[PDB]
Design a protein around this ligand. Structure first.
Ligand SMILES: *C(=O)[C@@H](NC(=O)/C(=N\OC)c1csc(N)n1)[C@@H]1N=C(C(=O)O)C(=C)CS1
Length: 469
């Protein structure tokens, strides 16, 4: 008898086109883990590199002879529908800059299982796996996990707090840029995400760094490896390289109300005589407070509604209005010189991550992320849809009970009151808004320095203008 890989229903993929090599590689890696433990009681010589080889190789052979049954997470019909979508629509990513590659991973928000993926436009013509092995910076999609998610979560801010987007410079003396802008004064957390302004993200991380929040603790809990957290542009996705698979897993976390389940493609390995060599252990972990996570899903639902940096919701509506009705949330990213684009989507029941780019690191059109990648993802989204009607779901994302609402002046994210404006102390009034907070006591009173970030010059022109009462 010979070894085999099966779809999650039970259908045999192949015996022992990305489909084959992904499930086989993850298969071998769990095999390696088990061999290294299966006695050969190792640790640390596991670090020596001559061994690694020996085992990796030994691993491969155990699958070739050995005769085991490998159970994947893959839902055949969706996976096929996905391959078809890329065959039928990959071409909408092409934008006068040569074949554009693509990597997507569709992940259950609750198991962490991967129901299917897109490896690239065409395994025959080119084999790198853009869903699994390639790594690029996630850009402005880092913002929600590494800056805002965290700070809200340490109650250092809430839903309508306020960030300086006034001009300001890295420590080298160069201007923090957004596309072509030097900045624009103050704005809500809402605006800053809907447009992905860079400066607000820059001030957020900086403040985290001054309270020394254990940022790394958080990122590490989702599976991220970032070699150096002391980079000023970190939050914008500077110094971070990731895979679609892995980062899809980051959006899975915000989506499953702050609870990370570890990504995977393999659920079970079973030996000839039925003995279980590997089985997926469900260990959940609570990376963000349900307060924080649900707050975030609210804001990330306007990121798509707003349509400011993605045409998606329009594209999807046009190809299928019912579905465009599911409670979608998401975020985009663009890297320097338009070299990559990212779009992450979740409804509460699934996540879809999608990266488009060139293999050799050159540039896409300006539109590629905002338009192309959006319309393509909307077609992929239908395609899964058609293949498995119930899959995406109808549930709403919802603000958790533990969230805490506050009345605050639109003008300063903060509860109204007296403040010190250079002699002449001030009664601070204007219209209010409810602002969500993931701490026990809600918003502060207004303070001269209400916003995250801002210079002295800044606050002066800001409070100046707030003064027309
Ligand atoms: C977010 O990704 C931010 N982009 C950038 O800061 C930089 N690129 O600008 C052309 C960048 C970030 S990391 C890196 N290596 N380069 C804004 N993101 C979007 C978006 O798609 O949401 C934009 C509309 C353009 S800039």
């Amino acid at each position: 008898s010979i070894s085999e890989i099966t779809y999650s229903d039970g259908t045999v993929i192949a015996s022992i086109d990305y489909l084959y090599f992904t499930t086989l590689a993850e298969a071998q890696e769990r095999m390696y883990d088990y061999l290294a433990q299966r006695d050969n009681v190792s640790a640390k010589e596991l670090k020596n590199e001559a061994t690694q080889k020996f085992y990796r190789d030994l691993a491969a052979k155990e699958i070739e002879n050995g005769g085991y049954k490998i159970t994947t997470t893959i839902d055949q019909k969706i996976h096929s529908a996905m391959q078809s979508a890329v065959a039928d629509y990959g071409y909408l990513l092409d934008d006068g800059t040569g074949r554009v590659e693509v990597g997507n991973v569709l992940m259950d928000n609750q198991t962490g299982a991967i129901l299917g993926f897109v490896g690239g436009r065409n395994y025959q013509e080119n084999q790198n796996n853009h869903a699994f092995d390639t790594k690029r910076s996630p850009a402005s999609t880092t913002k929600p996990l590494l800056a805002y998610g965290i700070a809200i979560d340490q109650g250092l801010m809430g839903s309508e707090t306020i960030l300086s987007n006034y001009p300001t410079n890295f420590a080298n003396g160069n201007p923090i840029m957004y596309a072509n802008s030097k900045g624009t004064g103050m704005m809500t957390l809402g605006e800053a995400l809907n447009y992905s302004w860079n400066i607000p993200a820059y001030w957020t991380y900086r403040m985290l760094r001054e309270n020394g929040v254990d940022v790394k603790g958080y990122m590490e809990k989702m599976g991220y490896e970032i070699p150096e957290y002391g980079i000023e542009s970190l939050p914008m996705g500077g110094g971070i390289e990731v895979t679609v698979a892995q980062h899809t897993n980051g959006y899975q976390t915000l989506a499953n109300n702050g609870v990370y389940h570890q990504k995977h493609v393999i659920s079970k390995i079973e030996a000839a005589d039925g003995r279980v060599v590997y089985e997926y252990q469900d260990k959940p972990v609570q990376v963000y407070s349900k307060a924080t996570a649900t707050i975030m899903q609210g804001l990330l639902r306007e990121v798509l509604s707003s349509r400011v940096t993605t045409t998606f919701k329009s594209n999807l509506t046009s190809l299928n209005p019912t579905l465009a009705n599911a409670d979608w949330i998401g975020k985009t990213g663009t890297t320097n010189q338009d070299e990559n684009m990212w779009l992450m989507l979740s409804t509460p029941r699934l996540t879809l991550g999608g990266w488009i780019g060139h293999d050799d690191n050159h540039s896409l059109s300006q539109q590629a992320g905002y338009s192309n990648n959006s319309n393509y993802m909307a077609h992929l989204v239908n395609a899964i849809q058609q293949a498995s009607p119930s899959i995406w779901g109808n549930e709403r994302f919802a603000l958790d009970p533990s969230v805490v609402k506050s009345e605050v002046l639109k003008s300063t994210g903060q509860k109204p009151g007296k403040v010190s404006v250079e002699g002449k102390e001030v009664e601070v009034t204007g219209s209010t808004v409810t602002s969500y907070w993931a701490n026990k006591s809600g918003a502060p009173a207004t303070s001269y320095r209400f916003a995250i970030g801002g210079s002295d010059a800044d606050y002066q022109n800001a409070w100046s203008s707030i003064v027309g009462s």
